[PDB]
Every structure is written in C-alpha cells, then in structure tokens.
Amino acid sequence: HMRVVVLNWDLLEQVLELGIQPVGAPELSSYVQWVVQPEVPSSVQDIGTRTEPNLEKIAALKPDVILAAGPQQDLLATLGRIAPVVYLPNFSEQDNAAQVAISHFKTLATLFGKEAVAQQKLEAMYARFSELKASLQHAFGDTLPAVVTLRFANPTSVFLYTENSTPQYVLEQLGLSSALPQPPKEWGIVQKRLSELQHVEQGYVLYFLPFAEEKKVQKSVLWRAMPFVQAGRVNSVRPVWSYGGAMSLRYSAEAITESLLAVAPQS
Amino acid sequence: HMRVVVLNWDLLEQVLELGIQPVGAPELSSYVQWVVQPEVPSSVQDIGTRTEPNLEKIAALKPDVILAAGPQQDLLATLGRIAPVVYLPNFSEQDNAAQVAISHFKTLATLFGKEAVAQQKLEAMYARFSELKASLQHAFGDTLPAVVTLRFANPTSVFLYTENSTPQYVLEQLGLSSALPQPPKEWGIVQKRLSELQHVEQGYVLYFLPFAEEKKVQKSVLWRAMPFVQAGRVNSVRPVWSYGGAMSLRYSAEAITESLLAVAPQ
Ligand SMILES: [Cl-]
Ligand SMILES: [Cl-]
C-alpha cells in the first residue's frame, strides 16, 4: 500500500473501489454532488482541480505514485518530477469508454495488488446487470423499450451519449436499445439542440442529475411539447458520473433501471 | 473484420480471447455464472441456447461467418443457408484440451489474422503453468499430491474427469497425478455414483463451481464420512468451464492451484 495522489474523478473511483485510500484527490466537494459514490474518505486532501492541480500541495503530500488521465496529459512531464506517474487515459474519440474503464480497473489492481477484490467487484457487477435486466423485462416485458441518455448543456442544448460512451454500454448490457444512436465522440458525448429530441417518438428519455435549471426546462414550451414528455416516458436519473471507472457502470445501471422502472407502464 | 456468430461457449471464449467480438452468442446470462472469464462484450446479442439456437435472430444479425462445435453438428446444413459455417468440434474420445482446444485456438487466430495475439497468450499460459507448479512444489514438496477433479451431476452422482479431459491435462501441467485415473470418454467425463469416492484415500478432491446443491451434499452422511472430507483434502473450485477453449486451461490451472494451496498442510 503506497501513497497515491489521484488527479481525476474516474481514477479516484477506481482506487477507492480497490480499497486504496489516496492521500490526494481533486475537487472533493464537487465530487460529492457529481459522483457521489464511492464515498471519498475524509482523510483524503483536496489537491486542486482536475485541469489545474496544486503541484506544491501534491509534492508536500510526498506521494509514491501519481495517477493521471486525459485532462492531465500536458502536465505529465512536470508531475513526473515529483513522483512516478501512471497515465491511464480514457474517453477519447477512438476509445470504448466502458471497456477501457474495466481494463484500467484491472491494471490498477495488478499494480496495487488488489486483483482478487477487482475480480469480485466485476463478477458482482455482471451479475447485477442480469438482475436489473430481468427487473426491466418483468415490468416492460419483451421486447425492452428504446432509451436515449443525456445531460443538459443548458435549457436549450443537450449532450447525447454516444456509441462509445459508458451509458451506452450500460443500456446494451441492460438489454435496452438506443432511441437516438450517435457516432463515437470524445467523452462519449455529442451536443444537440433541445428541439432535436422531437425525433424521439420512440419510448424513453433519461437525463442525469444534477442540473441546476431542471425546473426551468420542464415548464418550457419546447419541452412540454415533447413526444416522450407528453407520453410520460421521461425521468431524471440520480447523480452518477458518466465519465468514471469500472464500478460507475454498475451504479449507472442501477440508477438508470430505477428511473426506468418508474414511469414504466402498468403491466 | 467479419460479423461473427458463435454457437458454443468454448468457441465464444476462443474468439473473445483473440479480440474478435461476436455479434451473437448463446446463453450469455448462464455464461456469466459458468464460464465467468473471459467477460462478454455488451454488444453481443443472445441468440438462444447451444442446442437450439434462434435461427431468425441469427439470420437477422446478418453474420458473415458462423462458428459451430460438436453440439451444433446436426444444424450445420441449416446454418449453411444463412452464412458460411466454420465447424470446430471437440470433446470426442480424443484429447480435447492439450491439443484440440489449443489447436483450434491457433486455427481461429490464422483465420482472423490474430496469430501474434494467440502466441502471446499461449506462451504466457505455459509460463503460468510453471509458476503455479513451483508454487505447489514449495507448499507440498516435490512429491506433489494425487488429485481427483469432478463436477456433481446429482447430490448422489459425480462427473469424474478422464484421461482426455481438460482438468486432467491441467493437473499434469501442474505436476499433479490423478487419484482416480479414468479411460478416455466423450466430454472427458464419466458418470459415477458418489459412493465411489469412498475409494479415495490420501488423495485430494476438488469439485468445480457452480453447483446449486452443494450444501445438500455437504450435509449428507455419505459425503461427511468421506475419508478426504474428514482429512480436509477437499475444496470447491472457483467457476472455470471444464469444456472451454485454450485459455480456460490457464484459468483452470489458477483456480485449481488456488484450491489446493488453500487446503495445503499447515
Ligand atoms: Cl472526471
Ligand atoms: Cl459449451
């Protein structure tokens, strides 16, 4: 067990799930609102933001390894001057986010000697996927409805999750199909006008919390006139980080299932 | 790369271990409990069971090639009308693991341009055998124990793995001898009454998971009275498919070594 400084939320999730408490992590108070789980221990110090971390505080913590991701790639050489850096990037244009998250989860387990716990959590995850899938095809029957997932950029713009995203993986693993399929992008997202969601005659629309202007959207004319809105096939999803690690796939699956089991028809 | 539909779990493993992602595969839900590794990609659709594959789903998936094994040999003609079929049978009264499974692994790698990846995993498998072997040598001495490997058919019946089976091959790679040697059979198994395990003294007994009636056996008079149970030379083995592909030999070796080390003399 070494002294680990983590520089991204996905990596922060990974080490925590492995039972590795980092001495340094970014934006912890914001982590509470956007990622929620796994819970960051109070012992962990905040070392700044993911894009602009406090190098002096990182050095003062005297880590043994520094874990960096895509957004930190321009600081890799400098971070290396402080401590050895393990660079595990994800959510690139050509990355399949969920598979890469799973692969990184394993490699980190190998590095920190937590392979057994990693296997146990992945096994439980794949089993959990099947349970949730069954819960859906019991409330929806077969076949399962088409689902589109997104976050709000603003009350008139939307981030649709694409083919290489982690919610897409969750949907496929849940037996769900895509209502509005999208080509692979960076971070697994493409930005759309809100009016584009009119093309979702088919089934359900799920949007991830938090969103500060949720109430404003719900009252807007463009939203109240949506096919999925008038049909009641729309719901909010409790905060699950759509740019996280291996276990974020499990959390997403449960939260999505939960929101989708609600607003489901009377069987 | 082509659109691949596989119809058996062993071939599913073989294809996944190479990096080929099939568009269709059977009983994906059960695969998680029985084969476990390697994991199945999310985009893989379930095309039914191994013995009764959904012909319409398979046709709908529009494959460029269909992979079939022994259990699908009567459907080869049917499957031909849908797409070209590659037939890679195993587990006859032949040596399944050591040769066929490994040979099919090389064959499929050539057919899909994954020869380099195949060699890397095979070399790492053999090196892994020696690691787990030396580890067992340290705990047991160079005089390694005799082992009998099986799966429960019933709470009163077991499937002993025979000379030509995959666990028997693995045991020999770990420098382990067989406590109950058995002549070659189909699937590398012979069905015996549980009572015939009373014939096992000094040897270690390992049974594979999952078995839903494990507790039922463990509570029975016949099992509790077994000489290997009283001695402590028993252990369950973490789920590794005993009728899989080449990498299942590695997975089985790790799971078996793990079980034996856990019940090694204090
Ligand atoms: Cl992040
Ligand atoms: Cl099979």
Side-chain angles (χ1 to χ4, degrees), chain A residues 2-267, chain B residues 2-265:
Chain A
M2 325 164 69
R3 300 188 113 263
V4 178
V5 164
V6 120
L7 300 189
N8 231 29
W9 283 353
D10 59 338
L11 293 179
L12 178 53
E13 165 195 331
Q14 300 286 52
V15 289
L16 286 181
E17 296 286 353
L18 289 177
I20 302 282
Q21 288 193 359
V23 305
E27 301 174 69
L28 294 191
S29 61
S30 244
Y31 179 98
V32 173
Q33 306 299 323
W34 291 93
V35 186
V36 186
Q37 61 281 311
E39 180 192 352
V40 174
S42 58
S43 73
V44 189
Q45 294 216 49
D46 194 311
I47 42 89
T49 65
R50 296 159 288 174
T51 24
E52 213 116 273
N54 185 10
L55 288 171
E56 281 66 32
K57 194 170 186 178
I58 299 177
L61 287 177
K62 278 153 162 41
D64 302 311
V65 276
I66 299 176
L67 310 190
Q72 294 84 41
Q73 67 175 263
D74 287 328
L75 287 176
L76 293 184
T78 301
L79 292 154
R81 296 178 172 268
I82 304 178
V85 179
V86 187
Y87 175 64
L88 319 95
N90 198 349
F91 305 97
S92 104
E93 29 279 338
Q94 49 198 93
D95 284 332
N96 189 268
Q99 291 183 10
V100 177
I102 291 178
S103 184
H104 287 357
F105 184 67
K106 295 173 172 176
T107 55
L108 287 173
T110 300
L111 294 177
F112 295 103
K114 298 284 188 173
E115 278 137 302
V117 9
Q119 256 294 295
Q120 115 83 34
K121 288 206 169 186
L122 288 173
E123 287 169 359
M125 191 178 71
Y126 297 137
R128 184 55 172 169
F129 287 147
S130 300
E131 302 176 5
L132 301 174
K133 175 169 181 173
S135 301
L136 292 173
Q137 59 196 0
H138 252 79
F140 283 99
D142 324 344
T143 64
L144 293 172
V147 178
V148 57
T149 160
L150 61 301
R151 293 185 190 263
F152 284 102
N154 60 73
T156 53
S157 201
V158 140
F159 288 124
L160 292 181
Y161 283 96
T162 69
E163 184 184 7
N164 61 333
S165 65
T166 52
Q168 171 70 12
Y169 166 92
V170 161
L171 295 179
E172 297 175 5
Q173 207 76 278
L174 231 48
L176 295 163
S177 47
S178 308
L180 212 58
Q182 299 291 330
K185 294 263 146 174
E186 188 186 8
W187 299 108
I189 54 170
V190 62
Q191 190 172 354
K192 294 297 184 183
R193 306 177 305 265
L194 179 61
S195 58
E196 281 292 337
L197 293 193
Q198 278 182 118
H199 276 134
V200 193
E201 304 277 321
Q202 44 214 313
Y204 300 76
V205 167
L206 297 177
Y207 62 93
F208 293 112
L209 296 178
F211 177 48
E213 331 218 86
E214 186 203 29
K215 175 236 194 214
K216 180 176 187 200
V217 169
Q218 289 176 281
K219 315 168 305 178
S220 59
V221 189
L222 181 59
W223 175 267
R224 257 199 123 273
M226 288 294 176
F228 47 88
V229 163
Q230 288 175 314
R233 311 194 212 96
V234 59
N235 197 11
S236 65
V237 185
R238 60 179 175 90
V240 177
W241 194 231
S242 309
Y243 320 97
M247 289 301 104
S248 71
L249 306 173
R250 179 202 170 104
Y251 301 141
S252 299
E254 295 183 325
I256 284 176
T257 295
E258 164 186 337
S259 273
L260 204 57
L261 283 181
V263 323
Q266 328 286 55
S267 55
Chain B
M2 320 163 105
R3 298 182 58 84
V4 181
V5 162
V6 280
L7 300 176
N8 230 33
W9 281 354
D10 60 340
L11 294 178
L12 179 55
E13 166 193 331
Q14 301 279 58
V15 132
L16 287 179
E17 291 287 343
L18 291 168
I20 303 297
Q21 294 191 12
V23 298
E27 297 164 86
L28 305 183
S29 198
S30 285
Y31 179 98
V32 180
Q33 308 177 38
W34 291 89
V35 186
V36 180
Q37 343 99 270
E39 49 240 315
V40 178
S42 65
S43 58
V44 183
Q45 294 187 28
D46 196 304
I47 42 86
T49 72
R50 286 156 289 168
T51 57
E52 298 131 299
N54 194 327
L55 297 178
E56 185 187 339
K57 286 182 183 173
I58 289 172
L61 280 173
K62 243 81 175 182
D64 303 318
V65 57
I66 306 176
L67 306 197
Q72 296 93 45
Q73 63 188 289
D74 292 330
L75 304 170
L76 300 181
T78 307
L79 297 157
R81 309 184 118 108
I82 306 179
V85 176
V86 187
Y87 182 57
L88 310 96
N90 198 4
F91 303 98
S92 76
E93 259 202 44
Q94 75 208 143
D95 188 25
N96 48 43
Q99 329 300 345
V100 188
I102 286 179
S103 185
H104 284 359
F105 187 64
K106 295 174 170 179
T107 291
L108 285 171
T110 303
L111 294 178
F112 287 93
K114 254 69 164 57
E115 289 177 306
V117 158
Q119 245 308 292
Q120 295 171 1
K121 297 207 168 187
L122 282 180
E123 286 175 343
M125 180 184 66
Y126 291 132
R128 179 59 169 169
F129 284 160
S130 296
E131 294 180 3
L132 301 171
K133 184 179 184 175
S135 113
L136 286 172
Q137 290 179 343
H138 299 338
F140 290 98
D142 259 30
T143 37
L144 292 185
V147 188
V148 33
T149 160
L150 64 306
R151 282 187 189 253
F152 293 96
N154 309 322
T156 60
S157 182
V158 301
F159 283 135
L160 296 187
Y161 285 94
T162 67
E163 178 223 271
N164 66 318
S165 59
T166 87
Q168 179 61 30
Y169 166 72
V170 165
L171 288 179
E172 298 184 8
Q173 296 304 301
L174 297 177
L176 298 161
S177 51
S178 181
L180 275 177
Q182 225 74 26
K185 286 292 160 54
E186 201 193 4
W187 295 109
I189 59 176
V190 67
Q191 185 154 10
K192 295 303 189 65
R193 275 140 16 185
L194 172 66
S195 63
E196 301 203 10
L197 288 182
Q198 295 161 126
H199 209 167
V200 187
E201 302 191 36
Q202 190 57 74
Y204 286 74
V205 176
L206 307 177
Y207 62 91
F208 293 113
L209 293 183
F211 181 54
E213 314 261 61
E214 184 190 18
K215 290 290 172 295
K216 194 165 300 187
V217 173
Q218 290 181 334
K219 276 159 53 66
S220 60
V221 151
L222 177 55
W223 178 265
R224 285 169 46 238
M226 292 290 182
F228 50 85
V229 170
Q230 297 167 336
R233 308 190 196 95
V234 243
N235 206 345
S236 54
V237 189
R238 126 176 73 93
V240 281
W241 191 234
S242 308
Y243 319 101
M247 288 303 106
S248 69
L249 310 183
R250 173 191 175 97
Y251 300 142
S252 167
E254 299 165 345
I256 285 181
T257 299
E258 165 187 347
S259 289
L260 279 188
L261 285 173
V263 293

mmCIF file of all heavy atoms in Angstrom, chain B residues 45-79:
data_model
loop_
_atom_site.group_PDB
_atom_site.id
_atom_site.type_symbol
_atom_site.label_atom_id
_atom_site.label_comp_id
_atom_site.label_asym_id
_atom_site.label_seq_id
_atom_site.Cartn_x
_atom_site.Cartn_y
_atom_site.Cartn_z
ATOM 1 N N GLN B 45 -25.267 -10.051 -28.789
ATOM 2 C CA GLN B 45 -26.667 -10.404 -28.592
ATOM 3 C C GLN B 45 -26.839 -11.902 -28.341
ATOM 4 O O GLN B 45 -26.122 -12.726 -28.909
ATOM 5 C CB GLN B 45 -27.509 -9.976 -29.797
ATOM 6 C CG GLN B 45 -27.595 -8.467 -29.997
ATOM 7 C CD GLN B 45 -28.574 -8.080 -31.090
ATOM 8 O OE1 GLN B 45 -29.538 -8.798 -31.356
ATOM 9 N NE2 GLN B 45 -28.325 -6.946 -31.737
ATOM 10 N N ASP B 46 -27.792 -12.239 -27.479
ATOM 11 C CA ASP B 46 -28.085 -13.631 -27.150
ATOM 12 C C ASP B 46 -28.948 -14.275 -28.231
ATOM 13 O O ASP B 46 -30.060 -13.819 -28.500
ATOM 14 C CB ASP B 46 -28.777 -13.717 -25.787
ATOM 15 C CG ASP B 46 -28.761 -15.118 -25.208
ATOM 16 O OD1 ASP B 46 -29.238 -16.056 -25.883
ATOM 17 O OD2 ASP B 46 -28.266 -15.285 -24.074
ATOM 18 N N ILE B 47 -28.438 -15.341 -28.841
ATOM 19 C CA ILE B 47 -29.129 -15.989 -29.950
ATOM 20 C C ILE B 47 -29.783 -17.310 -29.546
ATOM 21 O O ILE B 47 -30.040 -18.166 -30.395
ATOM 22 C CB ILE B 47 -28.169 -16.239 -31.137
ATOM 23 C CG1 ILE B 47 -26.810 -16.744 -30.641
ATOM 24 C CG2 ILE B 47 -27.980 -14.966 -31.944
ATOM 25 C CD1 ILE B 47 -26.725 -18.241 -30.434
ATOM 26 N N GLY B 48 -30.054 -17.471 -28.254
ATOM 27 C CA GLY B 48 -30.704 -18.674 -27.767
ATOM 28 C C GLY B 48 -29.763 -19.617 -27.043
ATOM 29 O O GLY B 48 -28.773 -19.188 -26.454
ATOM 30 N N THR B 49 -30.077 -20.908 -27.091
ATOM 31 C CA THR B 49 -29.279 -21.927 -26.414
ATOM 32 C C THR B 49 -28.304 -22.600 -27.371
ATOM 33 O O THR B 49 -28.417 -22.459 -28.587
ATOM 34 C CB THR B 49 -30.168 -23.008 -25.775
ATOM 35 O OG1 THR B 49 -30.732 -23.831 -26.801
ATOM 36 C CG2 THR B 49 -31.283 -22.371 -24.963
ATOM 37 N N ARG B 50 -27.353 -23.341 -26.814
ATOM 38 C CA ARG B 50 -26.338 -24.018 -27.613
ATOM 39 C C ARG B 50 -26.905 -25.149 -28.466
ATOM 40 O O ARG B 50 -26.387 -25.446 -29.541
ATOM 41 C CB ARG B 50 -25.238 -24.565 -26.705
ATOM 42 C CG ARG B 50 -24.308 -23.501 -26.167
ATOM 43 C CD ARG B 50 -23.651 -23.961 -24.882
ATOM 44 N NE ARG B 50 -24.602 -24.011 -23.776
ATOM 45 C CZ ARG B 50 -24.354 -24.584 -22.605
ATOM 46 N NH1 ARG B 50 -23.184 -25.165 -22.385
ATOM 47 N NH2 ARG B 50 -25.277 -24.578 -21.653
ATOM 48 N N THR B 51 -27.966 -25.781 -27.980
ATOM 49 C CA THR B 51 -28.545 -26.929 -28.668
ATOM 50 C C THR B 51 -29.711 -26.521 -29.565
ATOM 51 O O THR B 51 -30.027 -27.207 -30.538
ATOM 52 C CB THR B 51 -29.020 -27.996 -27.666
ATOM 53 O OG1 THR B 51 -29.956 -27.413 -26.752
ATOM 54 C CG2 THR B 51 -27.840 -28.552 -26.883
ATOM 55 N N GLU B 52 -30.344 -25.399 -29.233
ATOM 56 C CA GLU B 52 -31.453 -24.878 -30.028
ATOM 57 C C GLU B 52 -31.307 -23.381 -30.294
ATOM 58 O O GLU B 52 -32.069 -22.578 -29.754
ATOM 59 C CB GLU B 52 -32.786 -25.148 -29.325
ATOM 60 C CG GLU B 52 -33.106 -26.619 -29.119
ATOM 61 C CD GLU B 52 -33.535 -26.922 -27.699
ATOM 62 O OE1 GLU B 52 -32.729 -26.689 -26.774
ATOM 63 O OE2 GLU B 52 -34.675 -27.396 -27.504
ATOM 64 N N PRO B 53 -30.331 -22.999 -31.134
ATOM 65 C CA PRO B 53 -30.105 -21.582 -31.434
ATOM 66 C C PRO B 53 -31.246 -20.958 -32.235
ATOM 67 O O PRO B 53 -31.801 -21.602 -33.125
ATOM 68 C CB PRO B 53 -28.814 -21.603 -32.256
ATOM 69 C CG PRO B 53 -28.812 -22.950 -32.900
ATOM 70 C CD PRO B 53 -29.408 -23.875 -31.879
ATOM 71 N N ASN B 54 -31.588 -19.717 -31.910
ATOM 72 C CA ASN B 54 -32.625 -18.994 -32.631
ATOM 73 C C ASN B 54 -32.179 -18.693 -34.055
ATOM 74 O O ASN B 54 -31.292 -17.867 -34.274
ATOM 75 C CB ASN B 54 -32.982 -17.699 -31.900
ATOM 76 C CG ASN B 54 -34.274 -17.075 -32.403
ATOM 77 O OD1 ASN B 54 -34.610 -17.170 -33.583
ATOM 78 N ND2 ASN B 54 -35.007 -16.432 -31.502
ATOM 79 N N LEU B 55 -32.801 -19.359 -35.022
ATOM 80 C CA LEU B 55 -32.392 -19.243 -36.417
ATOM 81 C C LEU B 55 -32.752 -17.886 -37.021
ATOM 82 O O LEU B 55 -32.064 -17.401 -37.918
ATOM 83 C CB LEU B 55 -33.016 -20.368 -37.245
ATOM 84 C CG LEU B 55 -32.604 -21.792 -36.864
ATOM 85 C CD1 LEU B 55 -33.326 -22.821 -37.724
ATOM 86 C CD2 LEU B 55 -31.098 -21.958 -36.979
ATOM 87 N N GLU B 56 -33.823 -17.272 -36.527
ATOM 88 C CA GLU B 56 -34.256 -15.981 -37.056
ATOM 89 C C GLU B 56 -33.378 -14.843 -36.543
ATOM 90 O O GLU B 56 -33.013 -13.948 -37.306
ATOM 91 C CB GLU B 56 -35.720 -15.705 -36.703
ATOM 92 C CG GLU B 56 -36.257 -14.429 -37.335
ATOM 93 C CD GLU B 56 -37.643 -14.064 -36.842
ATOM 94 O OE1 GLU B 56 -38.351 -14.961 -36.338
ATOM 95 O OE2 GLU B 56 -38.022 -12.878 -36.951
ATOM 96 N N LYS B 57 -33.052 -14.877 -35.253
ATOM 97 C CA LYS B 57 -32.138 -13.901 -34.667
ATOM 98 C C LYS B 57 -30.779 -13.957 -35.353
ATOM 99 O O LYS B 57 -30.191 -12.926 -35.676
ATOM 100 C CB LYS B 57 -31.966 -14.143 -33.166
ATOM 101 C CG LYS B 57 -33.151 -13.726 -32.314
ATOM 102 C CD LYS B 57 -32.858 -13.957 -30.840
ATOM 103 C CE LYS B 57 -34.058 -13.610 -29.977
ATOM 104 N NZ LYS B 57 -33.834 -13.987 -28.555
ATOM 105 N N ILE B 58 -30.287 -15.173 -35.566
ATOM 106 C CA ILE B 58 -29.010 -15.382 -36.237
ATOM 107 C C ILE B 58 -29.052 -14.807 -37.649
ATOM 108 O O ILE B 58 -28.124 -14.120 -38.075
ATOM 109 C CB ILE B 58 -28.636 -16.879 -36.287
ATOM 110 C CG1 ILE B 58 -28.248 -17.372 -34.889
ATOM 111 C CG2 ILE B 58 -27.493 -17.115 -37.263
ATOM 112 C CD1 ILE B 58 -28.038 -18.866 -34.796
ATOM 113 N N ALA B 59 -30.141 -15.078 -38.363
ATOM 114 C CA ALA B 59 -30.334 -14.542 -39.707
ATOM 115 C C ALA B 59 -30.465 -13.023 -39.688
ATOM 116 O O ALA B 59 -29.932 -12.335 -40.557
ATOM 117 C CB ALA B 59 -31.560 -15.168 -40.356
ATOM 118 N N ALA B 60 -31.176 -12.506 -38.688
ATOM 119 C CA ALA B 60 -31.376 -11.066 -38.547
ATOM 120 C C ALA B 60 -30.058 -10.345 -38.291
ATOM 121 O O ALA B 60 -29.843 -9.233 -38.781
ATOM 122 C CB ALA B 60 -32.365 -10.774 -37.425
ATOM 123 N N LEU B 61 -29.177 -10.986 -37.526
ATOM 124 C CA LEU B 61 -27.880 -10.408 -37.195
ATOM 125 C C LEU B 61 -26.960 -10.326 -38.404
ATOM 126 O O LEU B 61 -25.939 -9.645 -38.364
ATOM 127 C CB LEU B 61 -27.201 -11.212 -36.086
ATOM 128 C CG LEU B 61 -27.672 -10.929 -34.660
ATOM 129 C CD1 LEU B 61 -27.052 -11.913 -33.686
ATOM 130 C CD2 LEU B 61 -27.316 -9.502 -34.273
ATOM 131 N N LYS B 62 -27.328 -11.026 -39.474
ATOM 132 C CA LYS B 62 -26.589 -10.982 -40.735
ATOM 133 C C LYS B 62 -25.104 -11.286 -40.567
ATOM 134 O O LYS B 62 -24.268 -10.411 -40.771
ATOM 135 C CB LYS B 62 -26.756 -9.610 -41.396
ATOM 136 C CG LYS B 62 -27.450 -9.638 -42.737
ATOM 137 C CD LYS B 62 -28.960 -9.715 -42.598
ATOM 138 C CE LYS B 62 -29.615 -9.616 -43.961
ATOM 139 N NZ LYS B 62 -31.101 -9.644 -43.912
ATOM 140 N N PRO B 63 -24.769 -12.533 -40.203
ATOM 141 C CA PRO B 63 -23.357 -12.856 -40.000
ATOM 142 C C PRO B 63 -22.634 -13.134 -41.312
ATOM 143 O O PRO B 63 -23.272 -13.511 -42.296
ATOM 144 C CB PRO B 63 -23.416 -14.117 -39.135
ATOM 145 C CG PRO B 63 -24.660 -14.799 -39.590
ATOM 146 C CD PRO B 63 -25.634 -13.705 -39.980
ATOM 147 N N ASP B 64 -21.320 -12.936 -41.324
ATOM 148 C CA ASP B 64 -20.507 -13.287 -42.481
ATOM 149 C C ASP B 64 -19.961 -14.695 -42.303
ATOM 150 O O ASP B 64 -19.541 -15.341 -43.260
ATOM 151 C CB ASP B 64 -19.364 -12.288 -42.670
ATOM 152 C CG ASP B 64 -19.854 -10.862 -42.804
ATOM 153 O OD1 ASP B 64 -20.859 -10.639 -43.510
ATOM 154 O OD2 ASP B 64 -19.236 -9.962 -42.198
ATOM 155 N N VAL B 65 -19.983 -15.164 -41.060
ATOM 156 C CA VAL B 65 -19.458 -16.477 -40.720
ATOM 157 C C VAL B 65 -20.089 -16.979 -39.422
ATOM 158 O O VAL B 65 -20.310 -16.211 -38.483
ATOM 159 C CB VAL B 65 -17.913 -16.447 -40.590
ATOM 160 C CG1 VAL B 65 -17.465 -15.429 -39.546
ATOM 161 C CG2 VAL B 65 -17.369 -17.828 -40.267
ATOM 162 N N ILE B 66 -20.402 -18.271 -39.386
ATOM 163 C CA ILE B 66 -20.970 -18.893 -38.195
ATOM 164 C C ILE B 66 -20.027 -19.959 -37.639
ATOM 165 O O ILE B 66 -19.608 -20.864 -38.362
ATOM 166 C CB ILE B 66 -22.335 -19.535 -38.492
ATOM 167 C CG1 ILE B 66 -23.282 -18.512 -39.122
ATOM 168 C CG2 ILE B 66 -22.941 -20.116 -37.225
ATOM 169 C CD1 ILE B 66 -24.620 -19.094 -39.537
ATOM 170 N N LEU B 67 -19.697 -19.854 -36.355
ATOM 171 C CA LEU B 67 -18.812 -20.825 -35.722
ATOM 172 C C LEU B 67 -19.608 -21.841 -34.915
ATOM 173 O O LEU B 67 -20.401 -21.474 -34.050
ATOM 174 C CB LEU B 67 -17.792 -20.130 -34.817
ATOM 175 C CG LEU B 67 -16.933 -19.019 -35.426
ATOM 176 C CD1 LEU B 67 -15.718 -18.743 -34.551
ATOM 177 C CD2 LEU B 67 -16.511 -19.354 -36.846
ATOM 178 N N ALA B 68 -19.385 -23.121 -35.198
ATOM 179 C CA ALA B 68 -20.112 -24.185 -34.519
ATOM 180 C C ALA B 68 -19.176 -25.274 -34.018
ATOM 181 O O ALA B 68 -18.106 -25.500 -34.580
ATOM 182 C CB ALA B 68 -21.163 -24.781 -35.442
ATOM 183 N N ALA B 69 -19.589 -25.940 -32.947
ATOM 184 C CA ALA B 69 -18.840 -27.062 -32.402
ATOM 185 C C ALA B 69 -19.708 -28.317 -32.391
ATOM 186 O O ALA B 69 -20.775 -28.342 -33.007
ATOM 187 C CB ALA B 69 -18.345 -26.743 -31.003
ATOM 188 N N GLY B 70 -19.239 -29.347 -31.693
ATOM 189 C CA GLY B 70 -19.941 -30.618 -31.576
ATOM 190 C C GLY B 70 -21.455 -30.590 -31.425
ATOM 191 O O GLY B 70 -22.160 -31.231 -32.201
ATOM 192 N N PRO B 71 -21.968 -29.859 -30.422
ATOM 193 C CA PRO B 71 -23.416 -29.796 -30.181
ATOM 194 C C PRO B 71 -24.244 -29.192 -31.324
ATOM 195 O O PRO B 71 -25.470 -29.276 -31.278
ATOM 196 C CB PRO B 71 -23.521 -28.914 -28.932
ATOM 197 C CG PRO B 71 -22.223 -29.086 -28.245
ATOM 198 C CD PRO B 71 -21.207 -29.226 -29.330
ATOM 199 N N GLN B 72 -23.598 -28.603 -32.326
ATOM 200 C CA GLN B 72 -24.329 -27.979 -33.428
ATOM 201 C C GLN B 72 -24.148 -28.717 -34.754
ATOM 202 O O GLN B 72 -24.491 -28.191 -35.811
ATOM 203 C CB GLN B 72 -23.897 -26.517 -33.595
ATOM 204 C CG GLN B 72 -24.226 -25.616 -32.413
ATOM 205 C CD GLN B 72 -23.087 -25.516 -31.417
ATOM 206 O OE1 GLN B 72 -21.928 -25.343 -31.795
ATOM 207 N NE2 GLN B 72 -23.414 -25.622 -30.134
ATOM 208 N N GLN B 73 -23.624 -29.937 -34.694
ATOM 209 C CA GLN B 73 -23.274 -30.681 -35.906
ATOM 210 C C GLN B 73 -24.481 -31.109 -36.749
ATOM 211 O O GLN B 73 -24.349 -31.336 -37.952
ATOM 212 C CB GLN B 73 -22.444 -31.916 -35.543
ATOM 213 C CG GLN B 73 -23.177 -32.932 -34.675
ATOM 214 C CD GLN B 73 -22.262 -34.035 -34.176
ATOM 215 O OE1 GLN B 73 -21.828 -34.893 -34.945
ATOM 216 N NE2 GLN B 73 -21.958 -34.012 -32.884
ATOM 217 N N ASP B 74 -25.648 -31.226 -36.121
ATOM 218 C CA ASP B 74 -26.863 -31.608 -36.840
ATOM 219 C C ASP B 74 -27.555 -30.404 -37.474
ATOM 220 O O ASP B 74 -28.537 -30.556 -38.204
ATOM 221 C CB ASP B 74 -27.844 -32.328 -35.911
ATOM 222 C CG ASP B 74 -27.342 -33.689 -35.466
ATOM 223 O OD1 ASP B 74 -26.589 -34.335 -36.226
ATOM 224 O OD2 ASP B 74 -27.708 -34.119 -34.352
ATOM 225 N N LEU B 75 -27.042 -29.211 -37.189
ATOM 226 C CA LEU B 75 -27.646 -27.980 -37.680
ATOM 227 C C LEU B 75 -26.774 -27.305 -38.732
ATOM 228 O O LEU B 75 -27.126 -26.249 -39.255
ATOM 229 C CB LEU B 75 -27.898 -27.018 -36.518
ATOM 230 C CG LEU B 75 -28.756 -27.552 -35.369
ATOM 231 C CD1 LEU B 75 -28.736 -26.596 -34.187
ATOM 232 C CD2 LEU B 75 -30.180 -27.792 -35.841
ATOM 233 N N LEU B 76 -25.639 -27.926 -39.037
ATOM 234 C CA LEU B 76 -24.662 -27.369 -39.970
ATOM 235 C C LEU B 76 -25.260 -27.088 -41.345
ATOM 236 O O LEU B 76 -24.951 -26.073 -41.969
ATOM 237 C CB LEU B 76 -23.465 -28.315 -40.109
ATOM 238 C CG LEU B 76 -22.678 -28.619 -38.829
ATOM 239 C CD1 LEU B 76 -21.506 -29.545 -39.125
ATOM 240 C CD2 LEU B 76 -22.203 -27.340 -38.154
ATOM 241 N N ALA B 77 -26.115 -27.993 -41.811
ATOM 242 C CA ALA B 77 -26.786 -27.828 -43.095
ATOM 243 C C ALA B 77 -27.745 -26.641 -43.061
ATOM 244 O O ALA B 77 -27.818 -25.858 -44.010
ATOM 245 C CB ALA B 77 -27.527 -29.100 -43.473
ATOM 246 N N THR B 78 -28.477 -26.521 -41.956
ATOM 247 C CA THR B 78 -29.405 -25.414 -41.754
ATOM 248 C C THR B 78 -28.661 -24.088 -41.675
ATOM 249 O O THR B 78 -29.057 -23.100 -42.290
ATOM 250 C CB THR B 78 -30.231 -25.603 -40.465
ATOM 251 O OG1 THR B 78 -30.857 -26.892 -40.482
ATOM 252 C CG2 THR B 78 -31.290 -24.519 -40.339
ATOM 253 N N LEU B 79 -27.570 -24.082 -40.917
ATOM 254 C CA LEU B 79 -26.775 -22.878 -40.697
ATOM 255 C C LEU B 79 -26.042 -22.432 -41.957
ATOM 256 O O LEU B 79 -25.645 -21.275 -42.074
ATOM 257 C CB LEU B 79 -25.774 -23.111 -39.563
ATOM 258 C CG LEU B 79 -26.348 -23.408 -38.174
ATOM 259 C CD1 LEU B 79 -25.320 -24.145 -37.324
ATOM 260 C CD2 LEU B 79 -26.811 -22.130 -37.490
#
